[PDB]
């Protein structure tokens, strides 16, 4: 069980290479399952739910490893075994992609239901649905979706009852092998799908409209292979933007995608923030300026990351004035704030909505991380505070944030990794 | 980590000792800082947090033990330290109750902010903005929350924002030292409020209208001792009421107080039980009938109490139609309905409203424990479920539920404790 120590009252200044994006590398993973010639993987990040995944997949008879240069091999022409067990999916409910490809390729496949999560319910029920309408029989027996079809999957429209980044991979994942054409109506328009959708296409998919609320995908035999540079962590570059406009530095995010960041990047000016934007990095100049508060609400892409919502919380509560953050995605989406309260923040909390209250400079103390995106509020949090601070639980960052200590100390933090 | 295996298809029938209440256990051992001369309580059960909580009140300078007779002996007489640390208060945010008794009889007290938790949002501004009325100083630094008061605290009227146990409970407490007559309106009626009242009333408080939304006290110089046996639990008693319920079985609960069930009990009616109350005992008999969905909606005492909520999911999962469960007092408190669907449960979430679809059997499998009352309902629907049901991170029902492997072991249940 390691912690951070954290050392307060520091200016995050400096340069920070993007990795690229967990929720694009994820999908596009279990997407490979598709197949049936070598896939080669550049700018995946080292992170646990990578680990994991490959494990998954290893364990279907997919050959895979990441080599010298950190790219990742990956041949799944022999996969023998369809069954993403249990032991391994009840620590990653992503893996719940794994039966779409498996059944839409091999017919049958089955994946264990996700169990409680604490900022929210994750059913799959829209994963199912969509899956049925393509012509797959489901079953739920001991834990398990098991979906089989006698036949390939059949292609026809599907209008997914509420935006989901999920089930709209899922889906579109499957539609690749069906018979005839598949469109997914009020789709997720996240820049991960139009990436997944790009690498299934390089694969002799046939797929368009990614990236809007309307896909279009016209089934074929199988999928070939290919080579694939994962798009860049727009979820991990708005991240260190927030490090400088934080803490009155300046930032320079390297290996950037800006245009997949157009809602956060404007929030960031609106908080008083000059941000500069090349096709390969973004900028960020605080101007040693304490930044505004600003209102945010959470929507699914190309509004505002609920993603950037725990970051943009830590921005609000030191920045000038009072804030209104709507998060309307998840429903338990704000266990940052206690911790940050423990910090010096405040905020009053009401339905799916933290009015906060910003205030001049946070104090250093002990926290506990809940989540993914709160865990790093936490530690910058800690960056910017006085004194000393001590994240507990800093297990969670390392499910999206490759090397973060590096990174973070790169910008002029000092952090250290102990064990308690 | 422990974990439980459970085998299923059992009826739970039999008798069953319910002991007191952990919720009424807690505030009275954190009151008893009030106490100047010796104090002893019976019917106070086993539970971590009666632990966490003596280690707290020693490390204040209480004298505390439980004797061969389980009962607990306490002398306050000589804390010479007024501060609850972080190091044990973050394993239990009821410590927050610490503070209030502290400050009242010794003028000043210290008790770390409260962290994030996955059922919902808990801060502590009532219990703050409360004291602050009665005339305490407050300065949140370092993640603890400091009061101080120059003097002995002042009765005033306080009208609590929103229905709070826990708020009511530490105003309650300093009250009863401070100058003057203080009112507490709109108060919190839980059981449990009005027991720890008639606990500091045996020691000279002048406490009146607890368990009404009025409560009136007249404060006095100090509080002597006395002996006092813990209310039974009233959630211990619903919970293995629906162990019955959902089993077909038929069990008695003895040592109860039923008036403090009454909307549990006429839920259980209506869900097709009969159960007869005496003074002091509470018997169901399901009759070998499977339960009538019946809604549900969480509300403060009297109402239907949150702490059932999960218990009543299961009931209605395995019940005879459809159900409208809602809850209205946390915000994500349906962690166990995804662990329940592992098992073959039904049921559509939205909002704070999740829609329940009975089944007639369960399916034993592997589930993971999420809170309190989420892990006891899972070993219930484990002792129903076909085949074998293993509950994981099981460790949360020793925080509310003394022996509960003997109690259900003693109702006919097959319940193995082992580690993973
Ligand atoms: C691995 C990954 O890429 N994770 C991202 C993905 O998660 P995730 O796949 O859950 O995102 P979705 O957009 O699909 O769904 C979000 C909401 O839809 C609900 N829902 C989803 C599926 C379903 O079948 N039924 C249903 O009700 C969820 O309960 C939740 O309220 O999108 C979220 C929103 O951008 C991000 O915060 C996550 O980091
Ligand atoms: C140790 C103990 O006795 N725990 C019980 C107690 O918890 P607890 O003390 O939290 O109960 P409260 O009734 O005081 O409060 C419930 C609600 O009030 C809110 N709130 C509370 C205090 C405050 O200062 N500000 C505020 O906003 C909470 O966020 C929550 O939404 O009552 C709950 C409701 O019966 C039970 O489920 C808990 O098992």
Known sequence: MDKFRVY????????????????????????????????????????????????????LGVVVDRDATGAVLLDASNINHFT??????????????????????????????????????????????????????????????????????????????????????????????????????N????????????????????????????????GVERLTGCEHSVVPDRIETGTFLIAAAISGGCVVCQNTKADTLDAVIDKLREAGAQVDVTENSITLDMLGNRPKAVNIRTAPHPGFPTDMQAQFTLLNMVAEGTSIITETIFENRFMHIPELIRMGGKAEIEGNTAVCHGVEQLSGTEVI???????????????????????????????????????????????????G
Chains 1, 2 share one sequence.
């Open 8 to 59: 307060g009252q520091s200016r995050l200044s400096g340069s920070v290479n993007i990795s690229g994006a967990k929720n694009a590398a994820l999908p596009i993973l279990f997407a490979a399952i598709l197949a049936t010639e070598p896939v080669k993987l550049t700018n995946v990040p080292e992170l646990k739910d990578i680990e994991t995944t490959l494990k998954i997949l290893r364990q």
């Open 187 to 218: 789709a997720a328009r996240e820049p991960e799908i139009v990436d997944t959708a790009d690498f299934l296409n390089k694969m002799g998919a046939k797929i368009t409209g990614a990236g809007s609320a309307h896909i279009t995908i016209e």
């Open 84 to 185: 993403a067990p249990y032991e391994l999916v009840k620590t990653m409910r992503a893996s719940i992609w794994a039966l779409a490809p498996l059944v839409a390729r091999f017919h049958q496949g089955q994946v264990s239901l996700p169990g409680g999560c604490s900022i929210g319910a994750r059913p799959v029920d829209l994963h199912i649905s969509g899956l049925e309408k393509l012509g797959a029989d489901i079953v739920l027996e001991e834990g398990y979706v098991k979906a089989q079809v006698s036949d390939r999957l059949v292609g026809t429209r599907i209008v997914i009852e509420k935006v989901s980044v999920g089930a709209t991979l899922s889906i579109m994942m499957a539609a690749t092998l069906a018979k005839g054409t598949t469109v997914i109506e």
């Open 369 to 419: 991380a809940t989540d993914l995106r709160a865990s790093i509020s936490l530690v910058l949090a800690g960056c910017i505070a006085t004194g000393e601070t001590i994240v507990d639980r800093i297990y969670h960052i390392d499910r999206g944030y490759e090397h973060i200590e590096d990174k973070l100390r790169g910008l002029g933090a000092k952090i250290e990794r102990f064990s």
